[PDB]
Design a binder for these strands. Structure first.
Lengths: 156, 198, 210
RNA sequence: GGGAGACUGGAAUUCCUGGUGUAGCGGUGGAAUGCGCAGAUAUCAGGAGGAACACCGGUGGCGAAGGCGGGUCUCUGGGCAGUAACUGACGCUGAGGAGCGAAAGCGUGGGGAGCGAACAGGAUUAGAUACCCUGGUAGUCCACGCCGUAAACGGUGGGUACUAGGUGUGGGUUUCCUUGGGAUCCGUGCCGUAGCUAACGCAUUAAGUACCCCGCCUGGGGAGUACGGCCGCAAGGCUAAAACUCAAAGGAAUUGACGGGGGCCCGCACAAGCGGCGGAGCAUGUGGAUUAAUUCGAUGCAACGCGAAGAACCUUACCUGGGUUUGACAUGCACAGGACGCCGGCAGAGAUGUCGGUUCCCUUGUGGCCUGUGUGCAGGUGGUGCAUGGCUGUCGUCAGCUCGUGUCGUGAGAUGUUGGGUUAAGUCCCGCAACGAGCGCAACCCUUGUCUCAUGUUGCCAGCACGUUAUGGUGGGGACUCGUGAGAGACUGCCGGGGUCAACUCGGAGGAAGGUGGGGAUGACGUCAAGUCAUCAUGCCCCUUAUGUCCAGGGCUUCACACAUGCUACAAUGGCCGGUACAAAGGGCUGCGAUGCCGUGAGGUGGAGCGAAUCCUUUCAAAGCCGGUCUCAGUUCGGAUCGGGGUCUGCAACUCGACCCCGUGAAGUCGGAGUCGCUAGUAAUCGCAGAUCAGCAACGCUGCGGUGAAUACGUUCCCG
RNA sequence: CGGCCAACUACGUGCCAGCAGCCGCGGUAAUACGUAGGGUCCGAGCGUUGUCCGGAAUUACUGGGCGUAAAGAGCUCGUA
């Protein structure tokens, strides 16, 4: 389904408890394989722990962390003539939400809390303030993009 | 060309009219490289003719040998060619050229025999000649010497045709010995023909 | 190389019927063993005779062995002398009693098995193989009703060292079409130089006849 | 822009002096030597000096050929046309001969900006005596001479006459319209007949048709080399062999393959993701080493959980030993027979031997039966897949592969099958010296998705009745399933737009489903001397007193290693205990085996009931959900290993079975270079059944269902 | 007694021993090596070697060529 053009994608239902596209998409990216129900227990429990440490709507905290990790430019690896060129490219909306949620989950998974619920709670909170390692990966990705701005012209 | 002697209880071998004289001159397997190997086919240079002096030249392409011979028979069948003679000789010395094929076809006194190489010997043994004297100069081949011999027989013409081209009463076109040979050959045509009527 | 499935085994559900027909629970391995030894017993003298098909219907332990051949007269010599000898040996080799029905095909040249018989038996007899075949695609043509034929011969053709396969045909022989009614027959010539395996495909018609 | 001489012009590069002015400039695929920070590169003003002539300027002019382009002046060469005034064949060619003759090179004397062999450093690289970079001498320039060579090529000696044309452009004369057109002589290109040619091509500027003179060729190397001579300051040029050796070396075109060639396309090919392998332990297989034997096969992709869908004995092909001869097994001869063969007893590892009981069925000649003694002979998992058949893999489920008849070509061959668009596709349309066919692709078939009709037990249970314990359990019922038969339904059929008004493509409706709905089965012509003489069959060769055959024991399971596919892990999305909910498919006769009882548990005792929509595999699962505990640790993670104790299968678990109980408790903290799979019910994870099978090395293979994601911007890059 | 070039089968050695005018035959099924049968061609002879002409239009007077196959002097002027 590449090389024939764009392929049609599956529509994604929203969350029952919270009512967001982004909560369910966070669940499907929490899903270490097999246990979607257990992924729902991790995401739900982590967002009620975010509800405990904020006292507000958890999806607003989620979208504010999701905004504070969301990148605007990504670097490529295109190679013109015997030298590897980091090429910076504009990021689509779905690509940016994917990098935000995927970085959020993976660098929550590196973090050292006891369960997974406390990890994901503390990573959504620290990404809401801006103090997680995932925000530092957003700043390192914009570091590679702004450091490599000149190669971006190819218009590629 | 093997295993031709056969007796069949089938419908027919379809033997019929035109029992002509047919000579197969040469067969060289012709190969063609394609993806993964060689494809062998077959070429048969087929001479057909009757003893009057009508000659065919056929050129058969098939991937079986009797198939190529039969296609050369049908192609020379499609394309005959008239050869003018005197008795059973040829009229006058010619040289034919088919692009490298040189053949000199010279007449001779009768009794001498068809002296020619195997391709020219084939084209002249099918034809109505019995005593001429040829030679194949250049090109050392079968196809070019057959086709050059047929071009050489296209450079032939009647004594009468020459007389007609120049608007001259024969006698006045030939010399006399060759007119005497016309009298001899038409006289034996009369003897064998009137022995053919009775 | 050519990974071509046996087409009588590729249409045995759809068009071509099974050759052996019964029902068997816990008796099946025995019926298989008897079926094998019967077909070995009908290989030799009937392959002299001109055998094409060996069907075995099997009722409540009687047996019914039926053979489709091309000469009732070599299978049935003197009445009961040539028939009841092989019939009686089928009655003794099996632990059963045999009802042998023998019947003629209205032609050969349009049984693929019998075309393979006549071709390979000519090819053991030192004839020219291209005249072998191309004599067979001849006849085996025309006859009634037959919309294609395809003859392949591999092995030491003419006694040569190389094993050259040959491939002659005429008409339409579609193998991938399942409403084909193709008869197939491979029989193997036995020369002194070796064995010349002959495959014959015969496409009778488009007719499903469902 | 024919040549020579003389005088002169500007733009640009470099250096120089002087301003303005600061830390980089230069260079590259990416860099570094290099020039700078003492004032560079940059910019402005002035000066020197050399060489080359932007634009006009090109398929154009001139010259015999080399060759010739800033300008002007001076001297000089040739060509063309027009008139026909003159001479009156004075023409053509030209062996030797003299002259001219690019570039490089040579001599003597000048000149020396740019470029630049050699020559350095830098870089690249395995290594660069190379390409690329920085510098750089002879040279390139002028004067005067040498040299004499070039793909000095139109690869075509010079002269002359003739042989259909069409269209450009250069020089000049004239008839007509009145610059346009015509006609003409000379020039230079592109296309084209006839003719020619081996073919490509040439084709009035011939490679055509003919005449005149000259040069030159006689297979490829050896070799344009030696010897000798001539010229030259030298480098070298010119003239020019032989021995010897090869069976060829060549020309043009054809079909393929190939390219770090071009174009257009596709595929988990990359990208975007997800999960792995490679490190640990084990399970299997292979290499290697061992061995009495480690039977034999299969080594890129396409060998290595592969022949094996089941190695304790058997299997079994191997080894030590014990036996054996018409043999373990057939059948044809002779020859004797009368029972063969059996069920035992004994000795033996067992094969086997020796004793004990039974002794034939037809007939009169033998047959059914064997043993002998021989005879042909059987038997070989002995050899050759480079003698084969059959079966199979692979390129690739890729879109291709051909043929007939016609035409084109001396021929191999081409054409068709190329072109324009389209397709999952040589699918399909429109063109076209082709017109058609065939094997493929598609379709026919199975399964999955919806409904209709038929349909009632062993299957369902709504509406009825009866159960009480336990449930369709039971009388009953066709309503729902479901089971299996027949049938409808997807066709771009219906509407909108692009389409050449063609194919086909973008959207919409209806519909269970939308555009080959999903998955199968289906492998074209051939390739690879691919695989297999061990499934079988088989040609030829070999053994026949063993390479046959019978048995016991051993081996195929050995182990300092190395590879390969898998499984369990390294933990909290987890472990352990308790409670609880949902499958699909299958399997079953000397089989599957329930309640009950005995065990802790493998299991034991027992046999209900079933050849099975019924009985049994428990009413079937596990992951799931609810709850408790564990608190990040070499641990309540992990189970290898080792000890004790058992059960079952089998004549027999030592070498070598699985399972259970108690203890024991190792490596292992997500794994280097590299690399693999996968695009939706997919990946991932979770159990279940089956074949082979007495038992099992099953973590394998084949299937069944459960829960169930992420990503695909797009063809630049790697692979086919 | 491969092909040219009239005339073929078995046995024996299986890249050996050998053959051959050129093309080329021998790697355990050779019509090409050696022996046998058999055939063919010649015949008091029949093969080999050498030397010459022929085929060779391959030094082309009769009777060849020179765009790319070997082959047009680098280009002119001009003596015989």
């Amino acid at each position: 389904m590449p090389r024939k053009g764009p392929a049609p994608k599956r529509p994604l239902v929203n969350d029952p408890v919270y009512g967001s596209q982004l909560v369910t998409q966070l669940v499907n990216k929490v899903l270490l394989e097999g246990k979607k129900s257990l992924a729902e227990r991790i995401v739900y429990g982590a967002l009620e722990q975010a509800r405990e440490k904020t006292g507000t709507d958890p999806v607003v905290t989620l979208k504010r962390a999701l905004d504070n990790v969301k990148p605007a430019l990504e670097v490529r690896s295109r190679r013109v003539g015997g030298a590897t060129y980091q090429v910076p490219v504009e990021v689509r909306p779905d690509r940016s939400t994917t990098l935000a949620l995927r970085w959020l989950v993976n660098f929550s998974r590196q973090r050292r809390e006891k369960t997974m619920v406390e990890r994901l709670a503390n990573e959504i909170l620290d990404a809401s303030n801006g103090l997680g390692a995932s925000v530092k990966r957003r700043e390192d990705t914009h570091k590679m993009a702004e450091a490599n701005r000149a190669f971006a012209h190819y218009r590629w | 060309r093997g295993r031709r002697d056969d007796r069949g209880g089938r419908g027919r071998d379809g033997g019929d009219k035109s029992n002509y004289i047919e000579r197969v001159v040469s067969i060289n397997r012709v190969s063609k490289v394609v993806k993964g190997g060689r494809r062998f086919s077959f070429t048969a240079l087929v001479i057909v003719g009757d003893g009057k002096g009508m000659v065919g030249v056929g050129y058969g392409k098939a991937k079986e040998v009797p198939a190529a011979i039969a296609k050369g028979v049908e192609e020379a069948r499609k394309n005959f060619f008239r050869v003018p003679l005197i008795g059973s000789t040829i009229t006058h010395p010619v040289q034919g050229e088919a692009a490298a094929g040189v053949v000199m076809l010279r007449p001779a006194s009768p009794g001498t025999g068809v002296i020619a190489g195997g391709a020219a010997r084939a084209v002249l043994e099918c034809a109505g000649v019995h005593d001429i004297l040829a030679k194949s100069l250049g090109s050392d081949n079968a196809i070019n010497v057959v086709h050059a011999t047929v071009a050489a027989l296209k450079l032939l013409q009647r004594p009468e045709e020459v007389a007609a081209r120049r608007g001259l009463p024969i006698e006045d076109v030939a010399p006399a010995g060759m007119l005497k040979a016309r009298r001899e050959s038409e006289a034996l045509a009369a003897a064998a023909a009137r022995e053919g009527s009775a | 190389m050519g990974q071509k499935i046996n087409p009588h085994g590729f249409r045995l559900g759809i068009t071509t019927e099974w050759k052996s027909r019964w029902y068997a629970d816990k008796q099946y391995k025995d019926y298989v063993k008897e079926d094998v030894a019967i077909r070995k017993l009908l290989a030799t003298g009937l392959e002299r005779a001109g055998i094409a098909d060996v069907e075995i219907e099997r009722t409540r332990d009687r047996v019914r062995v039926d053979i489709h051949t091309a000469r009732p007269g070599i299978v049935i010599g003197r009445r009961g002398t040539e028939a009841d000898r092989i019939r009686a040996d089928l009655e003794k080799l099996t632990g059963k009693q045999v009802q042998l029905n023998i019947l003629e095909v209205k032609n050969p040249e349009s049984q693929a098995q019998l075309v393979a018989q006549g071709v390979a038996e000519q090819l053991s007899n030192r004839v020219a193989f291209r005249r072998a075949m191309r004599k067979a695609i001849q006849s085996a043509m025309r006859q009634p009703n037959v919309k294609g034929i395809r003859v392949q011969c591999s092995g030491r053709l003419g006694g040569a060292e190389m094993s050259r396969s040959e491939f002659y045909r005429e008409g339409r022989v579609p193998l991938h079409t399942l409403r084909a009614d193709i008869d197939y027959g491979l029989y193997e010539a036995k020369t002194t130089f070796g064995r010349i395996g002959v495959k014959v495909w015969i496409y009778k018609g488009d007719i499903v006849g469902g």
